Amino acid sequence: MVDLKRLRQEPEVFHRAIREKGVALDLEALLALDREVQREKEARLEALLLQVPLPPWPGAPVGGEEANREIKRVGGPPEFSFPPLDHVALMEKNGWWEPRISQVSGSRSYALKGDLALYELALLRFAMDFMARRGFLPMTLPSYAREKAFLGTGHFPAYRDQVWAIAETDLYLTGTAEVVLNALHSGEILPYEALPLRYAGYAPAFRSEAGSFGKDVRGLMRVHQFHKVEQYVLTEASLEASDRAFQELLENAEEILRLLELPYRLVEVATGDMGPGKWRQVDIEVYLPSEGRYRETHSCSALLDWQARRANLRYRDPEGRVRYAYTLNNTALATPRILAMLLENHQLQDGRVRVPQALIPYMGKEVLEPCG
Template identity: 45%
Template sequence: MLDIQYIRQNADTLQEIANKKHIQISIAELLEQHQLRSHTLQEIEQLRQQRNTLTRGISEQIRTSADTAEEMKQRVRDINVQLQKLEQQASQVLEKYDALMAIVPNTVSPDTPDGESDEDNVLLRQIGMPPVFTFPARDHIELGELHDMIDTARGVKVSGSRHYYLKGNGVLLHRAVQQLAFDLLMGKGYTPLEVPLMVRGSALHHTAFFPLGMDQTFRIGQEDHWLTGTSEVALVSYYQNEIIDLAEGPIRLAAASQSFRSEVGSAGRDVRGLYRVHQFAKVEQVVLCEANPEVSERIHQEITANAEELLQLLELPYQVVAVCVGDMSQKTYKQYDIETWMPGRQAYGETHSSSNLHDFQARRANIRYRTEAGELRFCHTLNNTAVASPRILIPLLENHQQEDGSIYIPAALRPYMNGMELLAAPPVTIN
């Protein structure tokens, strides 16, 4: 969230950002509600003061003038009626004001590209070359079925569309890429956490996944419990309503967790395979740092480099794009996406997203720190996917396939794969 005074001073700019981020909000209406809220609360306070003054004077008037005391009592009753109406009105105004404040977009960095959708994202760099196959290449589902390690048919049978089973070496690869990413972050000073997968709605509001992302989130029955789509929610919320200590530098957190997304709005898109599924695993990196744009920009480059290092260890070709304002979420100040080459799609597909939120998230979650001068300030928060699986298995299998159907295992993964250098092609069965 943003400070209301900042919103007032930058109303036109924020309305333009909201329009480009496809957020349906009127900043002018928000400011009107804020003014009405302030005026109503002021009236309520004045009436309460009048009532208190009258109440204190009644006992004195009882001793001197019963008629005056009765008049004062009637005035108190009248004020109570007015207060009841005003308090109801204030409650309605506050509810509307809070609802509008909850969807005000974050500002965007000066170097964020303009644009309406992911088609307007700007290529920053490409690392590695897509493989040129001299044979008919298989996609990840064909390879998974050939090696008996991906079974989408039974996943659909048991759980419905966008579900799957991983088997045998598919499970080993799934766990191996996560552990490689986890170990990479541990080596860079990240504190590992095992986090809740089910959180209260307040945690999702505090981290700005609600209310606009509510349709993407699975709810547990009628309770106020929701399955998270990323451990970012739990990692940031770990410090909600706290004053953190940044005296020794940024706080770096990492978690490996299951994640869940309803994928509302994606009907008919990426139905085949593992690209867009309801349940997946992520290793997430979250950093909390001082409210210094230069510091958070440096960390943004750092967390992006961590994900790039992981892809280089997996020996996969990828590209980094600067995400345009129209493809960014409400909470994001600046974002990079990393897209990995997927031969089966004949295109780069998003595998990582790296975001700098400045203090937008910390304000909602009320996470502050003390400056050297002792001033309390909201910190900056950043997040990035270190790896998400099974999506990463798509380029891993497809790029490293061999003509005979075998699959090369990158050297960095071999310690997590019992030393295997190759997933050998199954023997051909002749009927």
């Protein structure tokens, strides 16, 4: 949400903002109703108000998807002395996955077998241990929550269609732990000394798969239910504060990937590809050998007070001023997507896969062995 006060006080910033972001809103109709609300007008204005976007940071490329700018890239592709097989053919070759699950649960489902299943639980634990050395508080959470939490983040209303509802219930399956994490402090006045709150939340994750392509979705890439470890920071209301936390989030995600031993790169995301409440978004993408290209594995985002005004997240500033706080989030690691890149990038001559040094602890072995 945005502050109604400076909205009517500075409507061009918002018109320009709606422009560069491609939102379907005629700000003039809304601005009409906020005049008439001085009965019905009240609530009609609210549903409209919840669609006003945050103005993008000045360094963002203007344009949709294709204006996204590579910032930098770290690492270089693998040196193969055999044709790289793809992730699905590696899995199939080793008995590491069960195809019969599409018959049980339907499409875009996965079931892992043998060392790939133990690997999957290994990377999740490694991600939570790392966030915990890094000062972020570990939480294990549910995957369901009431409607007001989705409004809180801004997932409702823009993405309602991407969320599964539990029938005969007031609950919805969450697509990410920031939904829950975001709603925890709703309604409290937080003390200034508590700030910043750094949370690393784990939970099962669910999506309807309204966003669908007829391309690499298959295997481990876009499945309905998956595992996520999310980073979440609630901070005081200043850009110097926010920029420092955005920087932290990014180093975290780059460090995990350095430990995991994967080629990656950072992409400034353009205003038309950002989504309504964002101030800034960078994507980290990892190189996928078989596809020959870089695929997203993380999206770092600052939204300032846009969602703190939806979820009522406040603090008490040192003058005794009560202010809305600023929020930020970034993935730490999510399985199984990350496994498609890990398997192609680390395949051996013989189709077995090696384990990055940093995970030999959590796995107990250096090479993932075949099964049946």
